[PDB]
């Protein structure tokens, strides 16, 4: 077996119906081998290349791309569906690179894998189409994950009171958020998403959690107190622990929380003297002037003995930050998406070992 798959051109629409349009992300076969639909489609591309059949390669690629776009339009509100197709679009792109026969993409190949390179067609124009599509599919995933998290954020990060996580004497909780992040991470891993892509997804969703949290704090009257600063610092420390548990500290995710971290620190720091003001100006390098001024204006005294922050103290901070080219924006842009990349991730999977389970309904294709 050479690691190719043959099909009759008459069956191309049934191929993509069964492998893409109607394929269930929870099926046993594709969970035993993550990326299986991408490997099978690539093995089909190999045989059309072997035949030197331009029109068959063109038809298969168009049918494949159109079918992935159709699934994501119809069911693209579903996290598992979007994760699954993002993962498989990426793996299909990696296969087209790894088996292109271009020297730069072959550095991690076995001898046998090099024997599986395409021999008749340069598919660089389709690789570029797939890369461009992957950017948009990732944006779709980010918005689906945001919509799921959004109702939990303020309740769990701000409204739910704890004492270092424990109910105090004195709806969604911090634990709700962490369990939901757990679910997102589990599903991406089950789908074989690239580790470098999972890192980006996690950085983006930490950015969203921090930005929704800080904007909500800036827009209400009751979240700027010593007590709430303590709570926010605890909650962020558990988000950092989640990263450590997942071995994701190098994702950049913790750094995206710096504006919320600094706002919470402003709730704790001394707020009286000119040295206190200088310290705030050096500390708050991830908050705009308007954000610093808002938190200090909102700050609630810890008891009846404490005065509100004085207006002259706030003015001192405003005056000493004038040199900033500071954006007068009060709110973080919670819709920002960090530009995503898909670094080449070759696979050790040996194509000649791939079996086609009966459960996919692909009996009409043949191993070559």
């Amino acid at each position: 077996f050479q690691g190719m798959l043959e099909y009759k051109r008459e069956d191309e629409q049934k191929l993509v119906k069964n492998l893409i349009l109607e394929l269930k992300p929870r099926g046993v076969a594709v969970n035993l081998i993550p990326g299986l639909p991408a490997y099978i489609l690539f093995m089909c591309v190999r045989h059309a290349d072997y035949l030197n059949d331009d029109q068959k390669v063109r038809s298969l690629l168009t049918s494949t791309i159109n079918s992935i776009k159709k699934v994501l339009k119809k069911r693209g509100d579903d996290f598992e569906t979007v994760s699954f197709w993002l993962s498989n679009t990426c793996r299909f792109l990696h296969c087209l690179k790894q088996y292109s026969g271009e020297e730069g993409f072959m550095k991690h190949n076995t001898s046998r894998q090099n024997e599986h390179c395409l021999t008749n067609f340069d598919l660089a124009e389709y690789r570029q189409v797939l890369s461009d599509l992957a950017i948009q599919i990732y944006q779709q995933l980010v918005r689906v994950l945001e919509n799921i998290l959004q109702p939990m954020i303020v309740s769990g990060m701000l409204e739910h009171e704890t004492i270092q996580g424990v109910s105090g004497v004195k709806t969604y909780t911090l634990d709700s958020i962490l369990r939901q992040l757990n679910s997102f991470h589990s599903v991406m891993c089950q789908h074989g998403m690239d580790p470098e892509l999972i890192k980006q997804v996690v950085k983006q969703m930490f950015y969203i959690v921090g930005a929704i949290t800080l904007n909500n704090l800036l827009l209400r009257k009751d979240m700027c107190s010593w007590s709430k600063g303590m709570q926010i610092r605890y909650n962020v420390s558990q988000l950092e622990e989640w990263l450590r548990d997942k071995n994701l500290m190098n994702s950049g995710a913790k750094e995206t929380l710096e504006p919320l971290i600094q706002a919470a620190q402003l709730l704790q720091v001394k707020k009286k003297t000119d040295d206190d003001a200088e310290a705030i100006c050096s500390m708050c390098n991830a908050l705009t002037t308007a954000q610093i001024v808002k938190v200090l204006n909102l700050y609630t005294p810890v008891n009846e003995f404490e005065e509100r922050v004085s207006v002259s103290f706030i003015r001192t901070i405003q005056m000493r930050l004038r040199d900033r080219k500071d954006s007068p924006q009060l709110l973080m842009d919670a819709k920002h998406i960090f530009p995503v990349t898909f670094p080449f991730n070759p696979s050790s999977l040996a194509l000649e070992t791939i079996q086609i389970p009966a459960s996919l309904g692909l009996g009409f294709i043949a191993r070559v």
Binding site: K69, G101, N120, F121, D122, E125, Q136
Partner: peptide
């Protein structure tokens, strides 16, 4: 490594294929 044929897309075909939302 053989010389391979680059499969060329037209610009309208490329635009349609690479637009996620056209479907």
């Amino acid at each position: 490594q053989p010389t391979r044929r680059q499969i060329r897309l037209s610009s309208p075909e490329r635009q349609r294929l690479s637009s996620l939302n056209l479907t």
